[PDB]
């Protein structure tokens, strides 16, 4: 809602992503893969070389991914808050139907002969 | 798994997918109305901010 | 703006020159100052989709002030009707005109 | 499904971390262990499918296909490790990784509860399949075969993507359980005629439908043996499985939209059976055999009867094991003489007596000798198409005759007669080759004792 | 183009064929001219006369395809007394493809044109009947 | 070029783009484009050869022409509204001129002719800036003026760009000309969905930039500019051939790779608006892009092309190129599909 | 032409290892590869899997349905009711159009 803000203040009333979020685990995995590719293109032992470098790949991805996931969750909360409030403001456009049962509704039968 | 667990796990799955399905339909109709009438948070294309206007007395009166 | 850094930082880079009813040097007003003020205040905050229909009167008057197309049509008609009567010998302008 | 997805992924660390000389032993052993545990999917109920989560479910249709898929991975590893012996070590591990990733996409494809999740995995199988064909095929034409395989599939899939997304918009969901209850009838209109075509053409190309099948003989003749095994056994069945699910929401329009495709299949099956009588290439003969068999599956899915759906389900499983066996049998000859020409090496029953038994058993299942599940599937389809229209027994009858002629012609030409004099490198069959053949035919013949577990949801 | 397109769709199918053929010819001729203009601009003619020759060759070929489709589609509808049947445009579409094939002295082009133009024209009539939108107005 | 001068010129390329994206005034938007055009030309001429001179000249004439049409639209807009705010325009003639002006700046068809030639005539590092960073400013303007853009005009440009990009790349052996026609093809997808959902234009733009940066970085790593020169890569660095394969399949839009994501979300938005024929036509025509991506994968990774004897000398030296961010970019180019719902960050 | 390696000859695994199973050139690896294929393929999956399938509990409730049908026929025939009515659903719960 706030102009050119990555995370408006109201976003703090939502629960933050857990640090065991499955989406966050995937992002951390992508950082691990990036670390491996870095060793491979530079012709270093892929698994062993530069564990300090590999750690920072995992850490940076998880750090950025945590905030992206938080904004992602925030934008979907905002979408629903907007959508439900609009429905409340315009009842005549979203009228509750009278729900007929299947014993009353006539559906045509199409034999598979 | 016993039939009862799978049976009632299915009802839980169907509830979530039915609720999501209804919201998907509702969002399409809300989007249709908001865009056509411009009376909601979405499709709110900016107009000139009125705080830019200067209301001070001018060099001439008729303005 | 695509990125509203001006709002985030509260710095005015270019919006001081966006409209003619903004603050001018020595409070010199534009010719259509009142018309644009009325249009801007009518359409403020409701969005273009609504402003296109709900502020049509203000925008049309503002457009008339800017380009004066309806006035020039009106004056072109009177001037034409005068030459129609001058040649036909049906009207003598007054001394003051 | 995570009890199968995760151990399937763990096959990749296992292969890459294995000692240089144990990559085949380790991957083969542990992929067999995964195959063992897949039998737990047979906890099926009379009324309800087995629904694990919001993402994955397993009914009686997907369960046998999943078990076929996971059984095939160890067989493909056994079948490839000979011609990949001289391969670079890393390029051997990349080959195995392509097969493991294909199994991963496949078992998720058969259990996706949402159709757009099914679409992505259904499409994802292209990449590993294409890379196998074009990287590890032997001939120049493997490059053209890759392109035909890729663009035939995509020509159909991309319309399917539009149709599914349109269906989600109007219905609100693509969850297959939800579609069962929210399905509405399809009323005639040019708009629905093309919705029907978009929903069915992607699957028709995979089967393949006669006329749209040209990609298949190309791909088989150029693919490596493991590629041909998965192509025939499973990837063709993605078309059948997809059709069996999507036809739910195409009623009653399927009544008249089926006619052009039943005509193509009923006539196409006689045409492709007769092509087999004059094929000079053994792999190409088996490829064209699949087209004829899968024509029956297309007809059965389109006439939409309880007997035809049971027959289609059995045919897909039976064909999967038989066609995979036949490709493996032809490959063992190829690894010796290095040609696919059927008439090149003759009278092999004299030189390889036990491999000639496998050739016999494979042929008998291919011609549908009762009570094999090949015959159970083919018979159930013929019963239902007879009720659809009595005259279909004429076309079914002729196909059965021609199917026997080319099945035994392949047996007689390669195994009987006199051996070719100048061919003198026919070594005795290896244990690996004999075990590979028996791991095809024994489960195929065992399923005759208990055929209900491959008859599908309408049993 | 909107004015000529509207005229074609405002006279009912199967009625007043001459008027229809003028509309399809007008559309065809304009398409041929557009092709000539880019062709002359991007592949300079050796002489002014030739550039005129190329222009007339394309504009006539395009106009012929338009006239024959408009003639065939209207006459087939009137004869068959089926004004709103997509099949009429399929007959008109293929006939146009044949004219293109004749003007090119290539049977294979004529064969392919009669097909793809046949399907495309029949697809247009269904779109008109069912309201298929190509450039669909934004809505949601 | 002095290294300090190169950095100052690069930062001016970015400053001009930034000015366009933060300006609320049409005059400052025009200034941003002019400042950006001034700074990029010396990057094109950096190697000083006749092809660089021809490329820069063709670029200058095209961009300078577009700016005059851009300023014409702004002044017409001023006459008919009396303001300069960056938003919808108040005159249809102004909207057309501005829309064409931005189409020429992006190199959309039929204003596309400069893109293949300019890209071929400048180094790879300069080509990377041209086909990536230079798209930001014109797209950021379209993102703000779309409510007044003529739908038939913008969809016509999008259709022609996808066709001409797809067909144009089929006949190319030069890598820089292959990237150029690919860029034209991808520009069409971005503008095709702009009338319906500008958020999907940004997604396509971001993913296109990541994939395009990845490819250019890999071409720079090996100093390859032709198909045959790139076909020697399997003999120098085998790993780089696998990254090229994965990236190229991604640019083709194949699931489950990231490049499928924008094609997928654009088709969703178009169908929600009852646009069925256009997305179908667009998806099928994008198979042309997949075709000439697949040729590169064949000659690069899935076969082994003949090598030369002197290639053995290169085995004894390591890669010295910076290859900045390539490990990150390639992973993003390929393994992002599971995170598609993150597109709401762009909302 | 070019400088190319000639096509290598065919290696017969039996020449070096007359007891080869066709899995590996190393005899010890070749034996282990055979052992895992046979033990895990035949002894486990095929033998135990076949036994597991044979003793599946009432796969898709076919036996329960037969027991249930017996219960219904016994009841209905004793009470004189039809074995099976043509109407699946109670007609009092249906409201026809018109
Ligand atoms: C409001 C109104 C608009 C405002 C402007 C009003 C006018 C005021 C003047 C404006 C400046 C005009 C500048 C003219 C110019 O520089 O052109 C030089 C240009 C090239 O200069 P050149 O180096 O001396 O070449 C000499 C020969 O022409 C080349 O020799 P060649 O060997 O190449 O000869 C082959 C020739 C053969 O020509 C053809 O094939 C013509 C075929 C046409 C079919 C009919 O090739 C062509 O000409 C193809 C291009 C034809 C034009 C595209 C038509 C499609 O020459 C021309 O193209 C002739 C045009 C001159 C008249 C211009 C008419 C002005 C109106 C334009 C349209 C306005 C729309 C609004
Ligand atoms: C005597 C005359 C000669 C008869 C011919 C010999 C054959 C009969 C001998 C068998 C006698 C015993 C018997 O029939 O009972 C067995 C019984 C059948 O009879 P049953 O159904 O009555 O079971 C008996 C046990 N009770 C009484 C509890 C029901 O079970 C089976 O048949 C086992 C089925 C094996 C099929 C499963 C294959 C293994 C799966 C491995 C996975 C990989 C496979 C590939 C993937 C395929 C896709 C699914
Ligand atoms: C829980 C984990 C599950 C695994 C999921 C894998 C998903 C794909 C991840 C892609 C990123 C892989 C890492 C980047 C490649 C670097 C590895 C390499 O270049 O060569 C292999 C290398 C061993 O060879 P070497 O170069 O000598 O290094 C010595 C170190 N032992 O290093 C090694 O020892 C092996 C390193 C991994 C090899 C990966 C091989 C390519 C995999 C891509 C195929 C597509 C993935 C499957 C698709 C479905 C995705 C689930
Ligand atoms: C959308 C959802 C998915 C989320 C995507 C998230 C992507 C964004 C996350 C950032 C991506 C880049 C992360 C790169 C991590 C590797 C950094 C590293 O290990 O560097 C090792 C070393 C330089 O490290 P050093 O500069 O000394 O550390 C201090 C940094 N201020 O020296 C080296 O050898 C580095 C050389 C290899 C790196 C390539 C060249 C780039 C140079 C980067 C410099 C360091 C940047 C520090 C990154 C911090 C990011 C939080
Ligand atoms: C081929 C590529 C080159 C040619 C371009 C392809 C695009 C032209 C295809 C036209 C097909 C007709 C069509 O698109 O239907 C439009 C229809 C619009 O109906 P709508 O308004 O949204 O709903 C209310 C109805 N009054 O849409 C609907 O009503 C729903 C239809 C579902 C989506 C259908 C997708 C189109 C399928 C066309 C291809 C199908 C055949 C595939 C052939 C594969 C061969 C290997
Ligand atoms: C915005 C609204 C614009 C709508 C129309 C734009 C059409 C774009 C035309 C320019 C891009 C295509 C360039 C091209 O295809 O080549 C030019 C072509 C030259 O080839 P041509 O003379 O036609 O055939 C020679 C036979 N050997 O010359 C041509 O004939 C191309 C004609 C294409 C017309 C469409
Ligand atoms: C995760 C969920 C989302 C799913 C999306 C898909 C995820 C996968 C994304 C992949 C990202 C790219 C990174 C792939 C890592 C590949 C590792 C690898 O290929 O091994 C390295 C090796 C390079 O050689 P080298 O470093 O010198 O080691 C000694 C051998 N000479 O390589 C070689 O030597 C091979 C040289 C021969 C070339 C063989 C090419 C065929 C094998 C290609 C497999 C990878 C295909 C990836 C495409 C997508 C697959 C789905
Ligand atoms: C998100 C996308 C991130 C994309 C990051 C792009 C990183 C590309 C790194 C290229 C590899 C490093 C390199 O070799 O430098 C190339 C070039 C500098 O030029 P160079 O030839 O190396 O030497 C100049 C001496 N005359 O380096 C450059 O000039 C930088 C040009 C790339 C800048 C534009 C990047 C694309 C747009 C990013 C906006 C994302 C939103
Ligand atoms: C492999 C390709 C297979 C191709 C299979 C071809 C199947 C052909 C199906 C033709 C029937 C289509 O369905 C038919 O469409 C038209 C749409 O205009 C509907 O009819 C509608 O349009 C017609 C105009 O022609 C009007 O006269 C009618 O009043 C209106 O309701 C019909 O109610 C419907 O019966
Ligand atoms: C309902 C409205 C129907 C409108 C129909 C519109 C049809 C589309 C027409 C497009 C313009 C004609 O298209 C153009 O025709 C000429 C025919 O000479 C072709 O020209 C080709 O054939 C002949 C003989 O070879 C020569 O003209 C020319 O040397 C050759 O290139 C062009 O290659 C083609 O691009
Ligand atoms: C190579 C293949 C290229 C892609 C081929 C795709 C074919 C798609 C068919 C085009 C779309 C249908 O074609 C278009 O439909 C609309 C309806 O919305 C028609 O719209 C028409 O409806 C009314 C009648 O009700 C007419 O009086 C009016 O002139 C017009 O608005 C157009 O006259 C027609 O041109
Ligand atoms: C529930 C999960 C069960 C998983 C079961 C997986 C079964 C896998 C069976 C492979 C067993 C082979 O175990 C094997 O043992 C010996 C002794 O340690 C190892 O070491 C051996 O290498 C070579 C074989 O090439 C021998 O000649 C040598 O005598 C010995 O050093 C092998 O490297 C190892 O491969
Ligand atoms: N279609 C457009 N032009 N705008 C647009 N994205 N409308 C859709 C409305 C929407 C969707 C998701 C979210 I999260 C939010 Cl907050 C709002």
Swiss-Prot record, chain A:
Regions crossing the membrane: 50-69
Protein name: NADH dehydrogenase [ubiquinone] 1 subunit C2
Membrane as UniProt keyword: yes
GO biological process: mitochondrial electron transport, NADH to ubiquinone; mitochondrial respiratory chain complex I assembly
InterPro entries: NDUC2
UniProt keywords, alphabetically: Acetylation, Electron transport, Membrane, Mitochondrion, Mitochondrion inner membrane, Respiratory chain, Transmembrane, Transmembrane helix, Transport
Residue ranges that the Swiss-Prot or TrEMBL entry lists as coiled coil: none
PANTHER family according to UniProt: NADH DEHYDROGENASE [UBIQUINONE] 1 SUBUNIT C2-RELATED, NADH-UBIQUINONE OXIDOREDUCTASE SUBUNIT B14.5B
Organism, scientific name: Bos taurus (Bovine)
Modification(s) after translation: There is a minor unacetylated form of subunit B14.5b.
Signal peptide: none
Function: Accessory subunit of the mitochondrial membrane respiratory chain NADH dehydrogenase (Complex I), that is believed not to be involved in catalysis but required for the complex assembly. Complex I functions in the transfer of electrons from NADH to the respiratory chain. The immediate electron acceptor for the enzyme is believed to be ubiquinone.
Quaternary structure (record): Complex I is composed of 45 different subunits. Interacts with TMEM242.
Places the protein is found: Mitochondrion inner membrane
From Swiss-Prot, chain C:
Keyword annotations: Disulfide bond, Electron transport, Membrane, Mitochondrion, Mitochondrion inner membrane, Respiratory chain, Transport
Membrane topology: Peripheral membrane protein
GO biological process: mitochondrial respiratory chain complex I assembly
Entry protein name: NADH dehydrogenase [ubiquinone] iron-sulfur protein 5
Record has RNA-binding as a keyword: no
Disulfide-bond pairs as recorded: 32-65, 42-55
Domain notes: Contains two C-X9-C motifs that are predicted to form a helix-coil-helix structure, permitting the formation of intramolecular disulfide bonds.
Gene: NDUFS5
One GO cellular component term: respiratory chain complex I
Quaternary structure and partners: Mammalian complex I is composed of 45 different subunits. This is a component of the iron-sulfur (IP) fragment of the enzyme.
Summary of the function given for this chain in its UniProt record: Accessory subunit of the mitochondrial membrane respiratory chain NADH dehydrogenase (Complex I), that is believed not to be involved in catalysis. Complex I functions in the transfer of electrons from NADH to the respiratory chain. The immediate electron acceptor for the enzyme is believed to be ubiquinone.
InterPro entries: NADH_UbQ_OxRdtase_FeS-su5 (IPR019342)
Location (main, coarse): mitochondrion
Residues in CHCH domain copies: 29-73
PANTHER family, sorted: NADH DEHYDROGENASE [UBIQUINONE] IRON-SULFUR PROTEIN 5
Subcellular location: Mitochondrion inner membrane; Mitochondrion intermembrane space
Motif Cx9C motif 2: positions: 55-65
Similarity comment: Belongs to the complex I NDUFS5 subunit family.
Disordered: annotated segments: 83-97
UniProt motif Cx9C motif 1: location: 32-42
Coiled coil, from the record: none
UniProtKB/Swiss-Prot annotation, chain D:
Compartment(s) where it occurs, according to its Swiss-Prot or TrEMBL record: Mitochondrion inner membrane
Modified residues (N-formylmethionine): 1
InterPro entries on file: NADH4_N, NADH_Q_OxRdtase_chainM/4, NADH_UbQ_OxRdtase, ND/Mrp_TM
Enzyme Commission no: 7.1.1.2
UniProt membrane topology term: Multi-pass membrane protein
Pfam families on file: Oxidored_q5_N, Proton_antipo_M
Transmembrane segments: 22-42, 60-80, 94-112, 116-138, 147-167, 196-216, 224-244, 256-276, 284-303, 308-330, 351-371, 393-413, 435-455
GO biological process, one term: mitochondrial respiratory chain complex I assembly
Catalytic reaction equation(s): a ubiquinone + NADH + 5 H(+)(in) = a ubiquinol + NAD(+) + 4 H(+)(out)
Gene Ontology MF terms: NADH dehydrogenase (ubiquinone) activity; ubiquinone binding
Keywords (A to Z) from UniProt: Electron transport, Formylation, Membrane, Mitochondrion, Mitochondrion inner membrane, NAD, Respiratory chain, Translocase, Transmembrane, Transmembrane helix, Transport, Ubiquinone
Domain of life of the source: Eukaryota
A GO CC term assigned to this protein in UniProt: respiratory chain complex I
Subunit structure: Core subunit of respiratory chain NADH dehydrogenase (Complex I) which is composed of 45 different subunits.
The family this protein is said to belong to: Belongs to the complex I subunit 4 family.
PANTHER family given in the database record: NADH-UBIQUINONE OXIDOREDUCTASE CHAIN 4
Chain's role: Core subunit of the mitochondrial membrane respiratory chain NADH dehydrogenase (Complex I) which catalyzes electron transfer from NADH through the respiratory chain, using ubiquinone as an electron acceptor. Essential for the catalytic activity and assembly of complex I.
This protein's name: NADH-ubiquinone oxidoreductase chain 4
From Swiss-Prot, chain F:
Keywords: Electron transport, Formylation, Membrane, Mitochondrion, Mitochondrion inner membrane, NAD, Respiratory chain, Translocase, Transmembrane, Transmembrane helix, Transport, Ubiquinone
Residue numbers of N-formylmethionine PTMs: 1
Organism encoding this protein: Bos taurus
Subcellular location: Mitochondrion inner membrane
Membrane topology type: Multi-pass membrane protein
Protein name: NADH-ubiquinone oxidoreductase chain 2
Family: Belongs to the complex I subunit 2 family.
Function: Core subunit of the mitochondrial membrane respiratory chain NADH dehydrogenase (Complex I) which catalyzes electron transfer from NADH through the respiratory chain, using ubiquinone as an electron acceptor. Essential for the catalytic activity and assembly of complex I.
Pfam entry (one): NADH_dehy_S2_C
Subunit structure: Core subunit of respiratory chain NADH dehydrogenase (Complex I) which is composed of 45 different subunits. Interacts with TMEM242.
């Amino acid at each position: 809602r706030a102009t050119f803000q990555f995370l408006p203040d109201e976003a703090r009333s939502l629960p933050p992503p857990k640090l065991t979020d499955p989406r966050l685990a995937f992002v951390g995995f992508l950082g691990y893969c990036s670390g491996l590719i870095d060793n491979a293109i530079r012709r270093r032992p892929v698994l062993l070389a530069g564990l300090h470098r590999q750690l920072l790949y995992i850490t940076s991805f998880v750090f950025v991914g945590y905030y992206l996931l938080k904004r992602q969750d925030y934008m979907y909360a905002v979408r629903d808050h907007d959508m439900f409030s609009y429905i409340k403001s315009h009842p005549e456009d979203f009228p509750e139907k009278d729900k007929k049962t299947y014993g009353e509704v006539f559906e045509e039968f199409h034999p598979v002969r | 798994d016993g039939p009862e667990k799978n049976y009632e796990r299915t009802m839980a799955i169907l509830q979530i997918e039915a609720e999501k399905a209804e919201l998907r339909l509702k969002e399409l109709e809300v989007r249709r109305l908001m865009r056509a009438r411009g009376d909601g948070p979405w499709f709110h294309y900016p107009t000139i901010d009125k705080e830019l206007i200067d209301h001070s007395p001018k060099a001439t009166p008729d303005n | 703006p695509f990125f509203d850094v001006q709002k985030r930082l509260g710095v005015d880079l270019d919006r001081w020159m966006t409209i003619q009813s903004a603050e001018q040097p020595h409070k010199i007003p534009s010719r259509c100052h009142a018309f644009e003020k009325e249009w801007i205040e009518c359409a403020h905050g409701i969005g273009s989709i609504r402003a296109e229909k709900e502020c049509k009167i203000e925008f049309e008057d503002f457009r008339e002030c800017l380009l004066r197309q309806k006035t020039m049509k009106r004056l072109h008609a009177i001037r034409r009707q005068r030459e129609k009567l001058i040649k036909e010998g049906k009207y003598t302008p007054p001394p003051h005109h | 499904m995570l009890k199968y997805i995760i151990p399937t992924i763990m096959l990749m660390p296992l292969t890459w971390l294995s000692k240089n000389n144990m990559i085949w032993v380790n991957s083969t052993a542990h992929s067999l262990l995964i195959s063992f545990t897949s039998l737990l999917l047979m906890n099926q109920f009379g009324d309800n499918s087995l629904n694990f989560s919001l993402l994955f479910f397993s009914d009686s249709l997907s369960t046998p296909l999943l078990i076929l898929t996971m059984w095939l991975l160890p067989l493909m590893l056994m079948a490839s490790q000979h011609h990949l012996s001289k391969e670079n070590l890393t390029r051997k591990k990349l080959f195995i990784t392509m097969l493991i990733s294909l199994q991963l996409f496949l078992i998720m494809t058969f259990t996706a509860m949402e159709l757009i999740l099914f679409y992505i995995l259904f499409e994802a199988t292209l990449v590993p399949t294409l890379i196998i064909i074009t990287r590890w095929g032997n001939q120049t034409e493997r490059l053209n075969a890759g392109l035909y395989f890729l663009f035939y599939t995509l020509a159909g899939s991309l319309p399917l993507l539009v149709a599914l997304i349109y269906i989600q918009n109007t219905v609100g969901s693509l969850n297959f359980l939800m579609l069962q209850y929210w399905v509405q009838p399809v009323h005639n209109s040019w708009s629905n005629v093309f919705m029907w075509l978009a929903c069915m053409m992607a699957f028709m190309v995979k089967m393949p439908l006669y006329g749209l099948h040209l990609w298949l003989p190309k791909a088989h003749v150029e693919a490596p043996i493991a590629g041909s095994m998965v192509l025939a056994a499973v990837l063709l069945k993605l078309g059948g499985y997809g059709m069996l699910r999507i036809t739910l929401i195409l009623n009653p329009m399927t009544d008249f939209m089926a006619y052009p495709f039943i005509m193509l299949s009923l006539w196409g099956m006689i045409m492709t059976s007769s092509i087999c009588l004059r094929q000079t290439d053994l792999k190409s003969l088996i490829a064209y055999s699949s087209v004829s068999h899968m024509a029956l599956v297309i007809v059965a899915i389109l006439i939409q009867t309880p007997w035809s759906y049971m027959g289609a389900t059995a045919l897909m499983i039976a064909h999967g094991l038989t066609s995979s066996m036949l490709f493996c049998l032809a490959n063992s000859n190829y690894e010796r003489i290095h040609s696919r020409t059927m008439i090149l090496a003759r009278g092999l029953q004299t030189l390889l007596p036990l491999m000639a038994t496998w050739w016999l058993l494979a042929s008998l299942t291919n011609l549908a000798l009762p009570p094999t599940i090949n015959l159970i599937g083919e018979l159930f389809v013929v019963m239902s198409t007879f009720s659809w229209s009595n005259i279909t027994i004429i076309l079914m009858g002729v196909n059965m005759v021609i199917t026997a002629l080319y099945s035994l012609y392949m047996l007689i030409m390669t195994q009987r007669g006199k051996y070719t004099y100048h061919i003198n490198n026919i070594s005795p069959s290896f244990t690996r080759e004999n075990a590979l053949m028996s791991l095809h035919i024994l489960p195929l013949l065992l399923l005759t004792l208990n055929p209900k577990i491959i008859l599908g949801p309408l049993y | 183009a909107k004015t000529v397109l509207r005229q074609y769709w405002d006279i009912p199918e199967g009625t007043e064929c001459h008027r229809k053929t003028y509309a399809t010819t007008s559309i065809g001729g304009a398409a041929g001219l557009v092709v000539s203009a880019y062709s002359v601009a991007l592949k300079t003619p050796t002489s002014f006369l030739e550039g005129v020759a190329r222009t007339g060759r394309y504009t006539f070929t395009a106009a012929a395809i338009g006239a024959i489709f408009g003639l065939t589609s209207c006459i087939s509808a009137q004869v068959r007394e089926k004004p709103d049947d997509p099949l009429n445009y399929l007959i008109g579409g293929c006939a146009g493809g044949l004219i293109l094939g004749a003007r090119t002295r290539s049977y294979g082009i004529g064969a392919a044109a009669c097909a793809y133009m046949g399907l495309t024209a029949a697809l247009v009539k269904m779109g008109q009947l069912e309201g298929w939108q190509v450039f669909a107005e934004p809505k949601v | 070029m002095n290294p300090i001068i190169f950095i100052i010129i690069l930062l001016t390329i970015m400053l001009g783009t930034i000015i366009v994206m933060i300006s609320s005034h049409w005059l400052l938007v025009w200034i941003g484009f002019e400042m950006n055009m001034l700074a990029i030309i010396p990057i094109m001429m950096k190697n000083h050869n006749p092809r660089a001179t021809e490329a820069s000249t063709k670029y200058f004439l095209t961009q300078s022409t577009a700016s005059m049409l851009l300023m014409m639209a702004v002044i017409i807009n001023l006459m008919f509204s009396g303001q300069w705010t960056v938003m919808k325009l108040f005159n249809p003639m102004a909207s057309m001129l501005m829309t064409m002006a931005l189409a020429m700046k992006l190199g959309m068809a039929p204003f596309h002719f400069w893109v293949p030639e300019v890209t071929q005539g400048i180094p790879l590092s300069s080509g990377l800036i041209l086909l990536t960073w230079q798209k930001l400013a014109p797209m950021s303007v379209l993102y703000q003026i779309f409510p007044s853009i003529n739908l038939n005009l913008i969809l016509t440009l999008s259709v022609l760009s996808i066709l001409i990009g797809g067909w144009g790349g089929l006949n190319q052996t030069q890598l820089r000309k292959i990237m150029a026609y690919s860029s034209i093809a991808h520009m069409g997808w971005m503008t095709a969905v702009l009338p319906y959902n500008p958020t999907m234009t940004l997604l396509n733009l971001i993913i296109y930039i990541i994939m395009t940066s990845t490819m250019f970085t890999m071409f720079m790593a090996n100093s390859t500019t032709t198909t045959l020169s790139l076909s020697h890569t399997w003999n120098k660095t085998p790993i780089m051939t696998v990254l090229i394969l994965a990236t190229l399949l991604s640019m083709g839009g194949l699931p489950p790779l990231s490049g499928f994501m924008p094609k997928w979300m654009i088709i969703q938005e178009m169908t929600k608006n009852n646009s069925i024929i256009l997305p179908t036509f667009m998806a099928i025509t994008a198979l042309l892009n997949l075709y000439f991506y697949m040729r590169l994968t064949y000659s690069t990774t899935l076969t082994m092309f003949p090598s030369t004897n002197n290639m053995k000398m290169k085995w004894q030296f390591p890669l010295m190129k910076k290859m900045t961010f390539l490990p990150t970019m390639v992973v993003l180019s390929t393994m992002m599909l599971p995170l598609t719902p993150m597109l709401s960050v762009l909302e | 032409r070019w400088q190319e390696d000639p096509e290598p000859e065919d290696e017969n695994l039996y020449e070096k290892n007359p007891d080869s199973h066709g899995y590996d050139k190393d005899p010890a690896v070749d034996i282990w590869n055979m052992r895992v294929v046979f033990f895990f393929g035949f002894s486990i999956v095929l033998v135990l899997g076949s036994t597991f399938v044979a003793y599946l509990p009432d796969y898709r409730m076919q036996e329960w349905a037969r027991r249930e049908a017996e219960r219904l026929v016994k009841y209905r025939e004793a009470h004189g009711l039809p074995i099976m009515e043509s109407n699946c659903f109670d007609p009092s719960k249906i409201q026809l159009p018109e």
